[PDB]
Design a protein around this ligand. Structure first.
Ligand SMILES: [Mg+2]
Ligand SMILES: [Mg+2]
Ligand SMILES: [Mg+2]
Ligand SMILES: [Mg+2]
Ligand SMILES: [Mg+2]
Ligand SMILES: [Mg+2]
Ligand SMILES: [Mg+2]
Ligand SMILES: [Mg+2]
Ligand SMILES: [Mg+2]
Ligand SMILES: [Mg+2]
Ligand SMILES: [Mg+2]
Ligand SMILES: [Mg+2]
Ligand SMILES: [Mg+2]
Lengths: 100, 62, 141, 75, 142, 57, 144, 66, 57, 185
RNA sequence: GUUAAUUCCGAUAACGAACGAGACUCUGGCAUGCUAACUAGUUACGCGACCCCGGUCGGCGUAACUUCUUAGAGGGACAAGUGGCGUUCAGCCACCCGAGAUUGAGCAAUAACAGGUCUGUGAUGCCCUUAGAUGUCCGGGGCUGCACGCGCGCUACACUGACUGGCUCAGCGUGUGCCUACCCUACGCCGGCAGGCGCGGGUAACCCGUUGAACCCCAUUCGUGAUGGGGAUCGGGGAUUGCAAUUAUUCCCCAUGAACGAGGAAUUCCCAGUAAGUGCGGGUCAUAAGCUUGCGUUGAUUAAGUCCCUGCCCUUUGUACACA
């Protein structure tokens, strides 16, 4: 009944498109839905030396990865959940469907 | 000898070696006709009072 | 009409320490004199009946924020560890003094090892705390 | 070179001149007491709070660092 | 009867302070404790000065309870110093005449601007090759 | 190397690009390390639009 | 009270070491070797003395009481961790070691290490840093 | 230093000389006008262009410009 | 999955997967004109598209 | 509400800035009156908003120097509060007035530069700056390694500088710089 | 002339342009207007506790809502307005209204250097070794060795201070690993301490955690004394990690208590939430920050200029150099 899907991604545009597409599917099937809740973004940050050897001006990079997690709540049987989730998913977004 | 107060009427420009003195022309504020050139240390606006100890000697003009 | 948050704390902890003095049923330990209250201290406390003061201050912190265990009380009572030549850092208080304080204030019925862990402050202790606060307010004005 | 041999305890002449001259000063701080009476700062604080206990001195402000005392009024 | 509830935030460096106004008598307290004992108490009049400027007849009809979170001590007291003033401005604008709002904005801004508009300065990031944002390590010639 | 670079240049501009660049750096043309460079067209070096206008290999 | 009393000892000679009597007791005792701020405070806490007193204020019977506590710590409830020469190599007994026994037991331990010809004894004998310090850049002062 | 570059200035001149009638001295209108007309990608560049357009329009309504 | 690995090292592990896989197919398919891969990772399916020039080869 | 008063004690009115060159550059009266010498700042963004800072805040900022004391501002507002208390005890008159007198006396009128030296006269703001630096420097050096506290080393430095008693370090080096500039013109 | 700028204006045999700069991307700020939220909260409501109707509660549950929190779409500032200075040009200065009237970084290029890295590589030519191995393993040692000189930093020289209690505040983060053996920790007992033994939470806005961080603030003790400053050196003991600490891995307790009294010649960095003080995360990590990389807090003096010194750049000039 109280299904809860979680969408992790590295991109922002694709993830907003996926979650908006899923709530459009839930609106078309006319379901009560909780809005797309945004978790705070994770910024994986690695600071390495640019130089392979040791000499130079001490120059550092700032490589960062961003992880965006948006999650949705729906109220439907499992068949509806499988039918909506099995369609329309962008290749970069990773999905986790929890039940309770 | 008197000290005497004088009102800045026009800033001229920076002077000195490192550019740390500002030559500024200034009018004596009891006889407002007489106006002279003077090198000033520090930050100046137009329209403030300098306390000249000697009204006589003059700065060089650039 | 008067609670402890209405009054200053700086003399409240002294008044509650004097209250616990004239009460005298907290059962201080034996090593109160010979102990140093942290690894980051240099000397023992200058005031000899400091145990009543730390008991009163622990009672007051358990009032303001319940469920503080021994590690949380060390976090409250930590400070600079001047490492001599190395730069200073944060260092916790002593665990044994906070444990004996919590066990004293559990022996006397003021705190309670409650569910979800930690020491909660009982209505008997809350009664004592804010009537001492009313005494402090009356003593000021 | 120069060194201060301040007094830790009162000689009776020093205690007498504290009873005479100290409540006639326009400012009484433990520093200026110790500066002109050649005593320790701790002894200065103790003697000044003792003189306040005798009740010849007003306190105008009190702090952890410096406590500041004045004389009584003349009126 | 009617809910004259005004939430108003006020921010310093990172410290934010949410003042809540409603109908009542003149009590003001932060975190559940009154203004006269908020250490560091050396800056007591830096909390008192909106009340000292406006007079307690302005704060008579309202009771203000604020929450404080973030930053350090001076940032928090500047945050509540801002938030009480902005909360009284928003309350007087939404529930009584705005002529009183205009006169209290006038008296507050001609005293000090920080009471209503926030200080937009935040801390600048450290860069590599230095111990701080601008300063660099000690260069060693030869 | 001259023949190969002008070949891939003419192929890549007839295939149609707003600009090209090839650099061949090594011990071509003698034991001393020399660099040859063959460019035409507009090029962007700075900013972000090197991330989505030029592709490098 | 704040006046100087009679029989004010300006100097005490205690454990054949001079004590400046005009400074505070918990730091007047610290002139003796083998006893610091912490040990002096705990000895003046075992001896029931108000710590506010100076060292010429207080009387001869209780200063002999203090020195008995100092030379016999375990007999007046001072713990074994509080002592400087815990679990001695020769006689295995916990003892606080003071101001002639201090350097005597110190040269005893050094002569033990030199006599067994161990590495630490060799480093004390050669006059080097014994605790594994980098001697490349520091310690230039005493060694010419 | 707040100096307008050549990409601001050439675009502003050709906007005024092709669309003189739509424009006036109001920054906030002719901002939307140049947004309506031209494909300016970034809004900071759009604001630069519209501001220099207002400045040249004051110059044109007060005198001739080269 | 009861191994339940965190998301931070999950995306890192997927990146290292694509890095090792890209260099592996680079050394394999360089004669074919290998340009890259895109992994369309479904749950319970995994398509992995190689993009190259000589697809018959 | 009227009656703006420093800490709780002293009135911003009954103040007399004597030398009229420092009217606009000493901020004490009727608009620059505040309860505390602590403010959020923004006085060092542009050039001449240094002057519109109240003069007790500039004294407070000029006090906290030499490394171990950088950015202890509530500390030095405590020092300045005690310093006003001591001079109100000694002189029995207005402490910010005697501060004003200390600055207008302590400020060097004529100094030297390189254009061997040539004497140039100071700016009024530069004079306020050098006076508020010199008298804090004298108070700090007179309080260093001394039983006498800084909270009234600043105070007796203020009364000596306002008296022009020449036992003040600020007055002494004021006359020193005016002497050097008198010889070098 | 002007600008941060070959940035523009303007003279003008040039006119139209491209790269660089700038624009762009990430970031800080501002929205009581939008989107939303039991992994964030507020306000009410009802119980519960306590104090004398009311006050407090991070004590407990639910009716609205999104101000605070989170992060998406938008918007928002451009020298736009005014007044001067300036062909009235480019622009500069001041001020109003204003969240801001220069936030900070990333990317960065015709070219060069015989600058560095063959010790990052299953990137690599050539040479050398290749079985008594320069391959590889195992055991021990060294990389720390100390008459000296130099560089990066930490602690300090104290009273603006130290000590001991008291009060009260953060933001970055990270956290159970393919091989791979090692995670952050609450809470409860023992012990002075380092720590030890128990059950629990956490693959994380869910648990540590409301990260009760320091400096700071309040109250004692001290008293110009190498003193309670300073904590080097050194002795004795007690714990943890690891297969193993001796040349002391680290941590703890007691004692010992050195120079150091503000640093010559010389010299480093920096202009606004900046310098400086202060602590906290990350990397390295079995043990672990006197380092580096980030984060917050307390938070200034001075300056809004110049070519004087040191750098480099442009123009002109000279050349018998052009592998310059
Ligand atoms: Mg610890
Ligand atoms: Mg090559
Ligand atoms: Mg070669
Ligand atoms: Mg470009
Ligand atoms: Mg750029
Ligand atoms: Mg050692
Ligand atoms: Mg070496
Ligand atoms: Mg190969
Ligand atoms: Mg081998
Ligand atoms: Mg020393
Ligand atoms: Mg040793
Ligand atoms: Mg140098
Ligand atoms: Mg020639």
């Amino acid at each position: 009944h109280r299904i809860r899907i979680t969408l992790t991604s590295r991109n922002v545009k694709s993830l907003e498109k996926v979650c908006a597409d899923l709530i459009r599917g839930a609106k078309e099937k006319n379901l009560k839905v909780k809005g797309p809740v945004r978790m705070p973004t994770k910024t994986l940050r690695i600071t390495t030396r640019k130089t392979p050897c040791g000499e130079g001006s001490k120059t550092w990079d700032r490589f960062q990865m961003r992880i965006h997690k948006r999650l949705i709540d729906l109220h439907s049987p499992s068949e509806i959940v499988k039918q909506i989730t099995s369609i329309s998913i962008e290749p970069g977004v990773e999905v986790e469907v929890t039940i309770a | 000898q008197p000290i005497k107060l004088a009102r800045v009427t026009k800033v001229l420009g920076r002077t000195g070696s490192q550019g740390q003195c500002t030559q500024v022309r200034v009018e004596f504020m009891d006889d407002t006709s007489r106006s002279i050139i003077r090198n000033v240390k520090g930050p100046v606006r137009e329209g403030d009072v300098l306390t000249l100890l000697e009204s006589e000697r003059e700065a060089r003009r650039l | 009409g008067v609670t402890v948050k209405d009054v200053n704390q700086q003399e409240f902890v002294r008044a509650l320490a004097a209250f616990l003095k004239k009460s005298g049923k907290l059962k201080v330990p034996e090593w109160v004199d010979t102990v140093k209250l942290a690894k980051h201290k240099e000397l023992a406390p200058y005031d000899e009946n400091w145990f009543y003061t730390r008991a009163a201050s622990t009672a007051r912190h358990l009032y303001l924020r319940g469920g503080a265990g021994v590690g949380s009380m060390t976090k409250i009572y930590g400070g600079r560890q001047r490492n001599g030549v190395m730069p200073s850092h944060f260092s916790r208080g002593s665990k044994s003094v906070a444990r004996r304080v919590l066990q004293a204030l559990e022996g006397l019925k003021m705190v309670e090892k409650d569910q979800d862990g930690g020491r909660k402050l009982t209505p008997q202790g809350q009664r004592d705390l804010d009537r001492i606060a009313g005494q402090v307010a009356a003593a000021k004005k | 070179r120069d060194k201060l041999n301040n007094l830790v305890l009162f000689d009776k002449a020093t205690y007498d001149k504290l009873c005479k001259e100290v409540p006639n000063y326009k400012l009484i701080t433990p520093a200026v007491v110790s500066e002109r009476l050649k005593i320790r700062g701790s002894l200065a604080r103790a003697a000044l709070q003792e003189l306040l206990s005798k009740g010849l001195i007003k306190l105008v402000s009190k702090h952890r660092a410096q406590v500041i005392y004045t004389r009584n009024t003349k009126g | 009867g009617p809910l004259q509830s005004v939430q108003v935030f006020g921010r310093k460096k990172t410290a934010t302070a949410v003042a809540h106004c409603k109908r009542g008598n003149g009590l003001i307290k932060v975190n559940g404790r009154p203004l006269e004992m908020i250490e560091p108490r050396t800056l007591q009049y830096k909390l008192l000065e909106p009340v000292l400027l406006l007079g307690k007849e302005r704060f008579a009809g309202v009771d203000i309870r604020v929450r404080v979170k973030g930053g350090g001590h001076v940032a928090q007291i500047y945050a509540i110093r801002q938030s009480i003033s902005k909360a009284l401005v928003a309350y007087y604008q939404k529930y009584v005449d705005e002529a009183s709002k205009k006169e209290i904005k006038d008296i507050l801004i001609q005293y000090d601007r920080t009471l209503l508009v926030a200080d937009p300065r935040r801390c600048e990031s450290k860069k590599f090759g230095g111990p701080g944002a601008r300063a660099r390590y000690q260069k060693s010639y030869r | 190397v001259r023949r190969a670079c002008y070949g891939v240049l003419r192929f890549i501009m007839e295939s149609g690009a707003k600009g090209c660049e090839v650099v061949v750096s090594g011990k071509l043309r003698g034991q001393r390390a020399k660099s040859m460079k063959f460019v035409d067209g507009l090029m962007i070096h700075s900013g972000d639009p090197v991330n989505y206008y030029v592709d490098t290999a | 009270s704040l006046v100087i009393p009679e029989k004010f000892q300006h100097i005490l000679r205690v454990l054949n070491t001079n004590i400046d009597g005009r400074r505070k007791i918990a730091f007047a005792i610290t002139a003796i070797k083998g006893v610091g701020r912490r040990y002096a405070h705990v000895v003046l806490r075992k001896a029931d003395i108000d710590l506010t007193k100076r060292a010429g204020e207080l009387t001869e019977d209780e200063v002999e009481r203090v020195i008995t506590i100092m030379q016999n710590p375990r007999q007046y409830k001072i713990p074994d961790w509080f002592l400087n020469r815990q679990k001695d190599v020769k006689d295995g007994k916990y003892s606080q070691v003071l101001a002639n026994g201090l350097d005597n037991k110190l040269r005893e331990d050094l002569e033990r290490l030199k006599k067994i010809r161990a590495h630490r004894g060799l480093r004390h004998f050669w006059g080097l840093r014994v605790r594994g310090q980098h001697t490349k850049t520091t310690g230039r002062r005493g060694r010419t | 230093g707040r100096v307008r570059t050549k990409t601001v200035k050439k675009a502003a001149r050709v906007i005024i000389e092709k669309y003189y009638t739509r424009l006036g001295n109001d920054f906030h209108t002719n901002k939307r006008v140049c947004e309506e007309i031209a494909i300016i990608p970034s809004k900071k560049l759009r604001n630069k262009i519209a501001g220099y357009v207002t400045h040249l329009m004051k110059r044109i309504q007060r005198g001739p410009v080269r | 999955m009861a191994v339940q690995i965190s998301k931070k090292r999950k995306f890192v592990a997927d990146g290292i997967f694509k890095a090792e896989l890209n260099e592996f197919l680079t050394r394999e398919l360089a004669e074919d004109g290998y340009s890259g891969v895109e992994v369309r990772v479904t749950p319970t399916r995994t398509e992995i598209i190689i993009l190259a020039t000589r697809t018959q080869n | 509400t009227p009656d703006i008063k420093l800490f709780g004690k002293w009135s911003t009115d009954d103040v007399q800035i004597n030398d009229i060159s420092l009217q606009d550059y000493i901020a004490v009266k009727e608009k620059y009156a505040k309860y505390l010498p602590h403010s959020a700042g923004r006085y060092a963004a542009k050039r001449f908003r240094k002057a519109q800072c109240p003069i007790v805040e500039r004294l407070t900022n000029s006090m906290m120097m030499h490394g171990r004391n950088n950015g202890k501002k509530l500390m030095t507002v405590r020092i300045v509060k005690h310093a006003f208390e001591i001079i109100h005890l000694l002189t029995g008159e207005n402490p910010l007035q005697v501060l004003v007198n200390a600055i207008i006396n302590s400020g060097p009128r004529e100094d030297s530069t390189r254009i061997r030296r040539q004497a140039v006269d100071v700016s009024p703001l530069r004079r306020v700056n050098q006076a508020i630096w010199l008298l804090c420097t004298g108070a700090r050096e007179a309080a260093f390694r001394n039983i006498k506290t800084i909270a009234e080393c600043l105070a007796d430095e203020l009364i000596n500088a306002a008296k022009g008693s020449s036992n003040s370090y600020a007055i002494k080096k004021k006359d020193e710089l005016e002497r050097v500039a008198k010889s070098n013109r």
